Amino acid sequence: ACRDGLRAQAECRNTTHLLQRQLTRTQDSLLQAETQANSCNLTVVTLQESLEKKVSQALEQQARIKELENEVTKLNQELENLRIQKETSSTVQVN
Amino acid sequence: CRDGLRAQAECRNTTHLLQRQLTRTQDSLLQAETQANSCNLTVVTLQESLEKKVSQALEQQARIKELENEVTKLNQELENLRIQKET
Numbered sequence: 001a002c003r004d005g006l007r008a009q010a011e012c013r014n015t016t017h018l019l020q021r022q023l024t025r026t027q028d029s030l031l032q033a034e035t036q037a038n039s040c041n042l043t044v045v046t047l048q049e050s051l052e053k054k055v056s057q058a059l060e061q062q063a064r065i066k067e068l069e070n071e072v073t074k075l076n077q078e079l080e081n082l083r084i085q086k087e088t089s090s091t092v093q094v095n
Numbered sequence: 096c097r098d099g100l101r102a103q104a105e106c107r108n109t110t111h112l113l114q115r116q117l118t119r120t121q122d123s124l125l126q127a128e129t130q131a132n133s134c135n136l137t138v139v140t141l142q143e144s145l146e147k148k149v150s151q152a153l154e155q156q157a158r159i160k161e162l163e164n165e166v167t168k169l170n171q172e173l174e175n176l177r178i179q180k181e182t
Contacts, residue, residue: 005099012106019113026120033127040134047141054148061155068162075169082176 002096005096009099009102016109019117023117030120030124030127033131037131037134040131044137051145058148058151065158072165078173
């Protein structure tokens, strides 16, 4: 009889009911994932900020190392010059 | 019956709309998870680059201190030798 109809209507009502709950739960999971992505992005920006500072600082240090190397070379040459002056202090032309 | 045929066609249209919304939301969910996973990789990449740059800055600071010590040393040697000469 119309028993078949009542059963079909119940099935459809149950299915829509279930789908609504699944939809709400999936949307909630979506928003949770988006919340995680947002937080992660701030972490990325913070790391990028710190890396920029360190990259600049490393370059500054390399310039300073170069400056100091040049000074050590200069002072070593001055010491070497004094040693050579002593080495040659008795050297004359004899021919 | 007809009381059921109408109620059924409607409930069918609603089922389909909800199934469509669910699919869309699931797909957006997967995309958001991928954004989070990609971001996680970027974090690891940056953490490792930052660790190397921090370590480089430490090595370079050690070198700077060594060189500064050498400069002071040589400067004093030169001053002692210069005072000694013709005093």
